[PDB]
């Protein structure tokens, strides 16, 4: 059987005592296009697990009794999951010709009433002082019918959200009216819902992080090659040259700084030289990179030869040094 | 009994709408100490006999405050609260002025609300506390110069069930007068409670990263005991605001550590100099001597946009 | 010169002004047009208690007056209070750290953390007349950051 090792570093983490809804990995054996998954070929989807142990086992699911692990449609469904569920899981596809299995370690996580947990939280960038933004409860999708109306409360810390000065619960969404630095912190929504005469919980938490507006996303500003501070150095003074540069914040921003001897990654001829590279970030995540040059004796040619600091990030910039 | 003082916020309300004068600084609705309550009654400066009772059926006294719905023009006046612990007694006055409900009187009722431009900001409808003790969360309707703002409007968002009006991105044309309008519900009576907001725009403030301009290792020296020193910073544009020229050897702090009086730095100089430019300068002076003959010295310039520093070589 | 101070008036996130009424207390409420210059004006001066690009240590007290606000534990919980001072000595650098704050200013909106008690901020309720106070919760029900306008 075509078999892929478990997604070791691509791991799943789930809260105890409340419904999970796990999907079988089809990013391997991709198999999804023009109407999703094809069961038409008659490739039966088999599930089975092993636990933190040494043996595989058929998965009981019907008399659990409450179909507590029933897989309704090409995917697994725990209502509700339980700590004993921790372990490695396997799904495979069968055609008289076809086979393919894969595993993924399911770690069940206990939950504090203050929402403390080993669970990794998603960082959620939020632009500063924007007019109004908001966040939706992460993974509620598909857990319950459109017919039922859920109760759902939010919490900053263990601090429930009510009468907040600039945050407002609006059903599934949390709205931040003028996102200020004050707004950083882990947030957590907790959605409840009835099913077959029972209330299931769904608690999920993500950490909001306020960052710089795109309103001020601007080409890098060169500070050091200002020319008001003139770099002159008589023969052999161990001269140094710092290039501090401010970067506005953007997400897909690759901030780059590099010195230009004249267009070729220094070290032409002898010209011994090396870079020190410092860095700093505003509370807002505004990078400010810096570079410097330790130097030996200054050869006669250096002074009248020009070299320049550079930087670019979705925009490009340049500044001329002076000796 | 003593007269404690006049209540700072006078209240210029409009005619034909509710009013609530809460005894000044006496209560805060903090009614923890209220079992066998304290004696309390109001009275006009000129009109004393009042219980304060009611001219018609208008006036009465709710928890710690008397109301005037509707408040009539002529109701203008000054009032004093009363409090009585046999062990104590005192009084305080709230001023009051009622205007006619003419558009012309608006500029006098206006609350100045400020917002810097090219940013989002919020206008809150003021003085509504006494009436916002109900759960039908604030049914307010913001008008702009007699223009009702609907969710269809993209410039201004009325926050659902709140006092805030969200200006999404404020512009110069956004300045002017606005209106909060709380529809009340007392005893089954539905009444409008208007509030005039007047918005002032402000330009975001300049703040540039400065450069330092006195980096030379002390080119001169000789032990004349007189030590001259400048730390010249270049402000691209005049902004000596949060800008700070703190001089410290590095660790010393130049004060309360390095001096028992031996060394300090006096006045400062905001030169302005060259027209467009603006510049500032400090002066650390060892007034009569420089003896230890060794020190790491560091010029610290610091504002909201940069913490910078500078050190210098041995000297002569 | 002693310390470069400066007069200004703070006003909070919900537009509320900052008027005195004690001097055992301060309050944050909406001032009508004709009552605006009731709002206290501040003498903010740089004490330089601890260096950081983020925090600028600043002590601020009321001008044409001798009051300066400071944090202290009223029964082991941070409390904002107005302590009077010798007009002779002040304003001064290296001021007692009860009297010191470090303003966190970002894009013209500024908070004031307590030096004595980190993670405790000058705050105000959303209610109207309730006093200004030292606060432990940031970004919650109480307003922590304000905006200042310089004055003359
Ligand atoms: C799921 O599989 C992982 C990996 O196969 C298991 O972790 C292994 O356990 C042994 C015994 O402790 C370790 O010595 C190995 O290093 C682990 N394997 C790897 C690749 O690190 C784990 O036992 C399984 N998860 C659960 C919950 O049983
Ligand atoms: C919000 O969540 C983050 C991440 O869960 C918390 O940061 C952790 O804090 C501990 C110290 O108690 C660090 O040792 C961890 O390294 C942090 N986690 C990671 C991976 O970043 C943070 O404590 C939460 N914020 C608040 C204010 O409670
Ligand atoms: C869960 O694990 C414990 C410990 O091994 C076991 O005794 C118990 O039977 C399990 N719970 C259930 C519901 O079977
Ligand atoms: C079984 O599945 C494979 C995968 O698509 C396919 O190539 C093969 O034709 C199938 N065998 C049949 C037709 O049953
Ligand atoms: C008023 O009198 C009561 C009863 O003796 C006393 O408890 C209270 O302290 C007095 N008021 C004040 C503020 O002292
Ligand atoms: C309240 O205000 C609206 C809009 O100006 C007006 O149409 C209405 O007459 C007012 N309500 C009352 C009770 O007068």
PDB file of C-alpha atoms in Angstrom, chain B residues 21-253:
ATOM      1  CA  UNK B  21     -29.451  67.956  38.628  1.00  0.00           C
ATOM      2  CA  UNK B  22     -27.682  65.457  40.885  1.00  0.00           C
ATOM      3  CA  UNK B  23     -26.548  66.961  44.193  1.00  0.00           C
ATOM      4  CA  UNK B  24     -22.984  68.092  43.486  1.00  0.00           C
ATOM      5  CA  UNK B  25     -20.191  65.767  44.633  1.00  0.00           C
ATOM      6  CA  UNK B  26     -22.540  64.568  47.369  1.00  0.00           C
ATOM      7  CA  UNK B  27     -23.642  61.301  45.719  1.00  0.00           C
ATOM      8  CA  UNK B  28     -22.183  59.297  42.822  1.00  0.00           C
ATOM      9  CA  UNK B  29     -24.964  56.732  42.889  1.00  0.00           C
ATOM     10  CA  UNK B  30     -22.596  55.091  45.333  1.00  0.00           C
ATOM     11  CA  UNK B  31     -25.523  54.363  47.638  1.00  0.00           C
ATOM     12  CA  UNK B  32     -23.803  51.870  49.947  1.00  0.00           C
ATOM     13  CA  UNK B  33     -24.348  54.163  52.912  1.00  0.00           C
ATOM     14  CA  UNK B  34     -28.042  54.752  52.250  1.00  0.00           C
ATOM     15  CA  UNK B  35     -29.968  52.591  54.695  1.00  0.00           C
ATOM     16  CA  UNK B  36     -31.858  55.083  56.813  1.00  0.00           C
ATOM     17  CA  UNK B  37     -31.069  57.696  54.154  1.00  0.00           C
ATOM     18  CA  UNK B  38     -29.876  61.233  54.857  1.00  0.00           C
ATOM     19  CA  UNK B  39     -32.254  64.193  54.662  1.00  0.00           C
ATOM     20  CA  UNK B  40     -32.135  65.779  51.198  1.00  0.00           C
ATOM     21  CA  UNK B  41     -33.911  68.688  49.511  1.00  0.00           C
ATOM     22  CA  UNK B  42     -33.257  71.340  46.879  1.00  0.00           C
ATOM     23  CA  UNK B  43     -34.227  74.999  46.634  1.00  0.00           C
ATOM     24  CA  UNK B  44     -33.784  77.878  44.191  1.00  0.00           C
ATOM     25  CA  UNK B  45     -31.537  80.820  45.051  1.00  0.00           C
ATOM     26  CA  UNK B  46     -34.488  83.194  44.792  1.00  0.00           C
ATOM     27  CA  UNK B  47     -37.241  80.611  45.308  1.00  0.00           C
ATOM     28  CA  UNK B  48     -36.698  79.067  48.752  1.00  0.00           C
ATOM     29  CA  UNK B  49     -40.066  77.655  49.868  1.00  0.00           C
ATOM     30  CA  UNK B  50     -39.927  74.811  47.330  1.00  0.00           C
ATOM     31  CA  UNK B  51     -39.913  71.178  48.504  1.00  0.00           C
ATOM     32  CA  UNK B  52     -38.624  71.684  45.756  1.00  0.00           C
ATOM     33  CA  UNK B  53     -42.010  70.228  44.841  1.00  0.00           C
ATOM     34  CA  UNK B  54     -43.362  71.169  41.429  1.00  0.00           C
ATOM     35  CA  UNK B  55     -44.551  74.330  39.682  1.00  0.00           C
ATOM     36  CA  UNK B  56     -46.963  72.209  37.686  1.00  0.00           C
ATOM     37  CA  UNK B  57     -46.358  68.461  37.881  1.00  0.00           C
ATOM     38  CA  UNK B  58     -42.924  68.745  36.251  1.00  0.00           C
ATOM     39  CA  UNK B  59     -40.350  68.606  39.046  1.00  0.00           C
ATOM     40  CA  UNK B  60     -39.642  65.782  41.490  1.00  0.00           C
ATOM     41  CA  UNK B  61     -36.728  63.949  43.112  1.00  0.00           C
ATOM     42  CA  UNK B  62     -35.426  60.573  41.939  1.00  0.00           C
ATOM     43  CA  UNK B  63     -32.447  58.838  43.558  1.00  0.00           C
ATOM     44  CA  UNK B  64     -30.251  61.829  44.413  1.00  0.00           C
ATOM     45  CA  UNK B  65     -31.333  64.153  41.593  1.00  0.00           C
ATOM     46  CA  UNK B  66     -34.301  66.350  40.703  1.00  0.00           C
ATOM     47  CA  UNK B  67     -35.749  66.328  37.197  1.00  0.00           C
ATOM     48  CA  UNK B  68     -37.517  68.879  34.994  1.00  0.00           C
ATOM     49  CA  UNK B  69     -39.406  67.098  32.243  1.00  0.00           C
ATOM     50  CA  UNK B  70     -40.121  68.987  30.293  1.00  0.00           C
ATOM     51  CA  UNK B  71     -37.658  71.641  31.441  1.00  0.00           C
ATOM     52  CA  UNK B  72     -39.175  75.029  30.668  1.00  0.00           C
ATOM     53  CA  UNK B  73     -37.471  78.255  29.641  1.00  0.00           C
ATOM     54  CA  UNK B  74     -37.495  80.353  32.849  1.00  0.00           C
ATOM     55  CA  UNK B  75     -36.492  77.252  34.784  1.00  0.00           C
ATOM     56  CA  UNK B  76     -33.015  78.774  34.459  1.00  0.00           C
ATOM     57  CA  UNK B  77     -31.524  79.384  37.889  1.00  0.00           C
ATOM     58  CA  UNK B  78     -29.262  78.132  40.662  1.00  0.00           C
ATOM     59  CA  UNK B  79     -29.994  75.312  43.080  1.00  0.00           C
ATOM     60  CA  UNK B  80     -28.488  73.931  46.269  1.00  0.00           C
ATOM     61  CA  UNK B  81     -28.485  70.403  47.619  1.00  0.00           C
ATOM     62  CA  UNK B  82     -28.861  69.517  51.283  1.00  0.00           C
ATOM     63  CA  UNK B  83     -27.383  66.754  53.435  1.00  0.00           C
ATOM     64  CA  UNK B  84     -27.860  66.038  57.136  1.00  0.00           C
ATOM     65  CA  UNK B  85     -25.930  63.740  59.443  1.00  0.00           C
ATOM     66  CA  UNK B  86     -26.717  65.175  62.902  1.00  0.00           C
ATOM     67  CA  UNK B  87     -22.947  64.933  63.073  1.00  0.00           C
ATOM     68  CA  UNK B  88     -22.767  66.981  59.858  1.00  0.00           C
ATOM     69  CA  UNK B  89     -24.486  69.202  57.275  1.00  0.00           C
ATOM     70  CA  UNK B  90     -23.622  71.047  54.047  1.00  0.00           C
ATOM     71  CA  UNK B  91     -24.808  72.330  50.664  1.00  0.00           C
ATOM     72  CA  UNK B  92     -23.713  72.782  47.042  1.00  0.00           C
ATOM     73  CA  UNK B  93     -25.138  74.550  43.991  1.00  0.00           C
ATOM     74  CA  UNK B  94     -25.678  73.492  40.392  1.00  0.00           C
ATOM     75  CA  UNK B  95     -26.132  76.368  37.969  1.00  0.00           C
ATOM     76  CA  UNK B  96     -28.644  75.937  35.147  1.00  0.00           C
ATOM     77  CA  UNK B  97     -29.784  77.707  31.980  1.00  0.00           C
ATOM     78  CA  UNK B  98     -32.561  76.616  29.651  1.00  0.00           C
ATOM     79  CA  UNK B  99     -32.624  77.941  26.091  1.00  0.00           C
ATOM     80  CA  UNK B 100     -35.392  77.930  23.491  1.00  0.00           C
ATOM     81  CA  UNK B 101     -35.377  75.023  21.025  1.00  0.00           C
ATOM     82  CA  UNK B 102     -34.251  77.224  18.154  1.00  0.00           C
ATOM     83  CA  UNK B 103     -31.418  76.106  15.887  1.00  0.00           C
ATOM     84  CA  UNK B 104     -29.876  79.495  16.671  1.00  0.00           C
ATOM     85  CA  UNK B 105     -29.147  78.513  20.283  1.00  0.00           C
ATOM     86  CA  UNK B 106     -27.075  75.441  19.381  1.00  0.00           C
ATOM     87  CA  UNK B 107     -23.568  76.968  19.566  1.00  0.00           C
ATOM     88  CA  UNK B 108     -24.132  77.572  23.295  1.00  0.00           C
ATOM     89  CA  UNK B 109     -25.036  73.959  24.099  1.00  0.00           C
ATOM     90  CA  UNK B 110     -22.117  72.596  22.089  1.00  0.00           C
ATOM     91  CA  UNK B 111     -19.644  70.143  23.567  1.00  0.00           C
ATOM     92  CA  UNK B 112     -16.220  70.604  21.944  1.00  0.00           C
ATOM     93  CA  UNK B 113     -15.032  67.177  20.761  1.00  0.00           C
ATOM     94  CA  UNK B 114     -11.610  66.981  19.115  1.00  0.00           C
ATOM     95  CA  UNK B 115     -10.159  64.683  16.484  1.00  0.00           C
ATOM     96  CA  UNK B 116      -6.904  64.802  14.584  1.00  0.00           C
ATOM     97  CA  UNK B 117      -7.452  64.455  10.826  1.00  0.00           C
ATOM     98  CA  UNK B 118      -6.561  61.665   8.409  1.00  0.00           C
ATOM     99  CA  UNK B 119      -7.351  59.311  11.274  1.00  0.00           C
ATOM    100  CA  UNK B 120     -10.413  57.514  12.542  1.00  0.00           C
ATOM    101  CA  UNK B 121     -11.946  58.977  15.673  1.00  0.00           C
ATOM    102  CA  UNK B 122     -15.018  58.845  17.855  1.00  0.00           C
ATOM    103  CA  UNK B 123     -17.691  61.287  18.985  1.00  0.00           C
ATOM    104  CA  UNK B 124     -19.481  60.369  22.202  1.00  0.00           C
ATOM    105  CA  UNK B 125     -22.848  61.827  23.151  1.00  0.00           C
ATOM    106  CA  UNK B 126     -22.217  63.496  26.535  1.00  0.00           C
ATOM    107  CA  UNK B 127     -24.331  63.702  29.690  1.00  0.00           C
ATOM    108  CA  UNK B 128     -26.724  60.774  29.315  1.00  0.00           C
ATOM    109  CA  UNK B 129     -25.716  58.739  32.343  1.00  0.00           C
ATOM    110  CA  UNK B 130     -28.797  59.366  34.491  1.00  0.00           C
ATOM    111  CA  UNK B 131     -31.105  58.237  31.691  1.00  0.00           C
ATOM    112  CA  UNK B 132     -29.004  55.328  30.415  1.00  0.00           C
ATOM    113  CA  UNK B 133     -30.018  53.057  33.287  1.00  0.00           C
ATOM    114  CA  UNK B 134     -32.075  50.816  31.006  1.00  0.00           C
ATOM    115  CA  UNK B 135     -31.233  47.834  28.806  1.00  0.00           C
ATOM    116  CA  UNK B 136     -32.702  48.970  25.491  1.00  0.00           C
ATOM    117  CA  UNK B 137     -29.143  49.909  24.659  1.00  0.00           C
ATOM    118  CA  UNK B 138     -29.142  53.569  23.764  1.00  0.00           C
ATOM    119  CA  UNK B 139     -31.405  54.239  20.773  1.00  0.00           C
ATOM    120  CA  UNK B 140     -29.554  57.348  19.563  1.00  0.00           C
ATOM    121  CA  UNK B 141     -29.800  58.946  16.118  1.00  0.00           C
ATOM    122  CA  UNK B 142     -26.929  61.141  14.940  1.00  0.00           C
ATOM    123  CA  UNK B 143     -27.792  64.018  12.631  1.00  0.00           C
ATOM    124  CA  UNK B 144     -25.240  66.185  10.809  1.00  0.00           C
ATOM    125  CA  UNK B 145     -26.701  69.632  10.106  1.00  0.00           C
ATOM    126  CA  UNK B 146     -30.193  68.115   9.935  1.00  0.00           C
ATOM    127  CA  UNK B 147     -28.929  65.121   7.980  1.00  0.00           C
ATOM    128  CA  UNK B 148     -29.722  61.700   9.462  1.00  0.00           C
ATOM    129  CA  UNK B 149     -26.897  59.190   9.254  1.00  0.00           C
ATOM    130  CA  UNK B 150     -27.916  55.696   8.099  1.00  0.00           C
ATOM    131  CA  UNK B 151     -25.805  52.542   7.966  1.00  0.00           C
ATOM    132  CA  UNK B 152     -25.963  53.248   4.239  1.00  0.00           C
ATOM    133  CA  UNK B 153     -23.597  56.099   5.053  1.00  0.00           C
ATOM    134  CA  UNK B 154     -19.942  55.184   4.523  1.00  0.00           C
ATOM    135  CA  UNK B 155     -18.338  58.195   6.205  1.00  0.00           C
ATOM    136  CA  UNK B 156     -19.879  57.850   9.653  1.00  0.00           C
ATOM    137  CA  UNK B 157     -20.761  54.702  11.538  1.00  0.00           C
ATOM    138  CA  UNK B 158     -23.275  54.918  14.368  1.00  0.00           C
ATOM    139  CA  UNK B 159     -22.181  52.284  16.881  1.00  0.00           C
ATOM    140  CA  UNK B 160     -25.016  49.869  17.619  1.00  0.00           C
ATOM    141  CA  UNK B 161     -26.553  50.674  20.989  1.00  0.00           C
ATOM    142  CA  UNK B 162     -23.891  53.124  22.132  1.00  0.00           C
ATOM    143  CA  UNK B 163     -23.032  56.792  22.469  1.00  0.00           C
ATOM    144  CA  UNK B 164     -20.210  56.690  19.927  1.00  0.00           C
ATOM    145  CA  UNK B 165     -20.204  57.985  16.362  1.00  0.00           C
ATOM    146  CA  UNK B 166     -17.356  56.473  14.383  1.00  0.00           C
ATOM    147  CA  UNK B 167     -15.715  58.856  11.944  1.00  0.00           C
ATOM    148  CA  UNK B 168     -13.943  56.380   9.668  1.00  0.00           C
ATOM    149  CA  UNK B 169     -11.305  58.719   8.266  1.00  0.00           C
ATOM    150  CA  UNK B 170     -11.775  62.327   9.295  1.00  0.00           C
ATOM    151  CA  UNK B 171     -11.314  65.175   6.832  1.00  0.00           C
ATOM    152  CA  UNK B 172     -11.454  68.965   6.933  1.00  0.00           C
ATOM    153  CA  UNK B 173     -15.054  68.981   5.711  1.00  0.00           C
ATOM    154  CA  UNK B 174     -16.011  66.825   8.689  1.00  0.00           C
ATOM    155  CA  UNK B 175     -15.643  69.727  11.119  1.00  0.00           C
ATOM    156  CA  UNK B 176     -18.874  71.305  12.309  1.00  0.00           C
ATOM    157  CA  UNK B 177     -21.904  70.682  14.512  1.00  0.00           C
ATOM    158  CA  UNK B 178     -23.519  67.299  15.165  1.00  0.00           C
ATOM    159  CA  UNK B 179     -26.414  65.992  17.286  1.00  0.00           C
ATOM    160  CA  UNK B 180     -26.941  63.178  19.766  1.00  0.00           C
ATOM    161  CA  UNK B 181     -30.626  62.353  20.201  1.00  0.00           C
ATOM    162  CA  UNK B 182     -31.697  59.935  22.917  1.00  0.00           C
ATOM    163  CA  UNK B 183     -35.351  58.983  22.815  1.00  0.00           C
ATOM    164  CA  UNK B 184     -36.447  58.541  26.425  1.00  0.00           C
ATOM    165  CA  UNK B 185     -39.059  56.305  28.043  1.00  0.00           C
ATOM    166  CA  UNK B 186     -40.256  57.367  31.487  1.00  0.00           C
ATOM    167  CA  UNK B 187     -43.634  56.272  32.865  1.00  0.00           C
ATOM    168  CA  UNK B 188     -44.566  55.583  29.242  1.00  0.00           C
ATOM    169  CA  UNK B 189     -43.623  59.049  28.009  1.00  0.00           C
ATOM    170  CA  UNK B 190     -41.322  59.121  24.999  1.00  0.00           C
ATOM    171  CA  UNK B 191     -39.130  62.228  24.849  1.00  0.00           C
ATOM    172  CA  UNK B 192     -36.199  63.419  22.787  1.00  0.00           C
ATOM    173  CA  UNK B 193     -32.922  64.320  24.643  1.00  0.00           C
ATOM    174  CA  UNK B 194     -30.676  66.305  22.308  1.00  0.00           C
ATOM    175  CA  UNK B 195     -26.956  67.037  22.635  1.00  0.00           C
ATOM    176  CA  UNK B 196     -24.946  69.436  20.438  1.00  0.00           C
ATOM    177  CA  UNK B 197     -21.503  68.109  19.538  1.00  0.00           C
ATOM    178  CA  UNK B 198     -19.008  70.367  17.776  1.00  0.00           C
ATOM    179  CA  UNK B 199     -16.030  68.707  16.133  1.00  0.00           C
ATOM    180  CA  UNK B 200     -12.598  70.304  15.927  1.00  0.00           C
ATOM    181  CA  UNK B 201      -9.942  68.885  13.627  1.00  0.00           C
ATOM    182  CA  UNK B 202      -6.228  68.970  14.464  1.00  0.00           C
ATOM    183  CA  UNK B 203      -3.155  68.366  12.307  1.00  0.00           C
ATOM    184  CA  UNK B 204      -1.012  65.370  13.243  1.00  0.00           C
ATOM    185  CA  UNK B 205       2.152  66.683  14.867  1.00  0.00           C
ATOM    186  CA  UNK B 206       5.625  66.816  13.334  1.00  0.00           C
ATOM    187  CA  UNK B 207       8.232  64.517  14.847  1.00  0.00           C
ATOM    188  CA  UNK B 208      11.485  63.947  12.980  1.00  0.00           C
ATOM    189  CA  UNK B 209      14.502  61.792  13.745  1.00  0.00           C
ATOM    190  CA  UNK B 210      17.337  64.187  14.633  1.00  0.00           C
ATOM    191  CA  UNK B 211      21.013  63.795  13.825  1.00  0.00           C
ATOM    192  CA  UNK B 212      23.849  64.685  16.190  1.00  0.00           C
ATOM    193  CA  UNK B 213      26.544  67.109  15.000  1.00  0.00           C
ATOM    194  CA  UNK B 214      29.334  67.359  17.605  1.00  0.00           C
ATOM    195  CA  UNK B 215      31.032  63.928  17.209  1.00  0.00           C
ATOM    196  CA  UNK B 216      34.654  65.115  17.195  1.00  0.00           C
ATOM    197  CA  UNK B 217      36.882  63.668  19.872  1.00  0.00           C
ATOM    198  CA  UNK B 218      37.804  66.695  21.969  1.00  0.00           C
ATOM    199  CA  UNK B 219      40.269  68.231  19.512  1.00  0.00           C
ATOM    200  CA  UNK B 220      41.335  70.797  22.109  1.00  0.00           C
ATOM    201  CA  UNK B 221      42.368  70.577  25.779  1.00  0.00           C
ATOM    202  CA  UNK B 222      45.072  71.736  28.213  1.00  0.00           C
ATOM    203  CA  UNK B 223      43.641  71.724  31.757  1.00  0.00           C
ATOM    204  CA  UNK B 224      42.543  75.360  31.772  1.00  0.00           C
ATOM    205  CA  UNK B 225      39.869  73.878  34.029  1.00  0.00           C
ATOM    206  CA  UNK B 226      37.250  75.546  31.833  1.00  0.00           C
ATOM    207  CA  UNK B 227      35.434  72.878  29.828  1.00  0.00           C
ATOM    208  CA  UNK B 228      33.392  73.981  26.819  1.00  0.00           C
ATOM    209  CA  UNK B 229      30.902  71.508  25.376  1.00  0.00           C
ATOM    210  CA  UNK B 230      28.047  71.429  22.842  1.00  0.00           C
ATOM    211  CA  UNK B 231      25.760  68.621  21.713  1.00  0.00           C
ATOM    212  CA  UNK B 232      24.268  69.908  18.460  1.00  0.00           C
ATOM    213  CA  UNK B 233      21.169  68.107  17.157  1.00  0.00           C
ATOM    214  CA  UNK B 234      19.539  68.776  13.784  1.00  0.00           C
ATOM    215  CA  UNK B 235      15.751  68.972  13.647  1.00  0.00           C
ATOM    216  CA  UNK B 236      14.705  68.899   9.995  1.00  0.00           C
ATOM    217  CA  UNK B 237      11.730  71.018  10.991  1.00  0.00           C
ATOM    218  CA  UNK B 238      11.033  72.970  14.169  1.00  0.00           C
ATOM    219  CA  UNK B 239       9.863  70.327  16.631  1.00  0.00           C
ATOM    220  CA  UNK B 240      11.556  70.854  20.028  1.00  0.00           C
ATOM    221  CA  UNK B 241       8.530  69.111  21.558  1.00  0.00           C
ATOM    222  CA  UNK B 242       9.149  65.784  23.331  1.00  0.00           C
ATOM    223  CA  UNK B 243      12.753  66.225  22.207  1.00  0.00           C
ATOM    224  CA  UNK B 244      15.202  65.838  25.080  1.00  0.00           C
ATOM    225  CA  UNK B 245      18.914  66.534  25.337  1.00  0.00           C
ATOM    226  CA  UNK B 246      20.037  64.450  28.310  1.00  0.00           C
ATOM    227  CA  UNK B 247      23.785  64.387  28.916  1.00  0.00           C
ATOM    228  CA  UNK B 248      25.316  61.412  30.724  1.00  0.00           C
ATOM    229  CA  UNK B 249      28.875  60.128  30.774  1.00  0.00           C
ATOM    230  CA  UNK B 250      27.296  56.744  30.039  1.00  0.00           C
ATOM    231  CA  UNK B 251      26.518  55.523  33.525  1.00  0.00           C
ATOM    232  CA  UNK B 252      27.089  58.616  35.668  1.00  0.00           C
ATOM    233  CA  UNK B 253      23.925  60.562  34.720  1.00  0.00           C
TER     234      UNK B 253
END
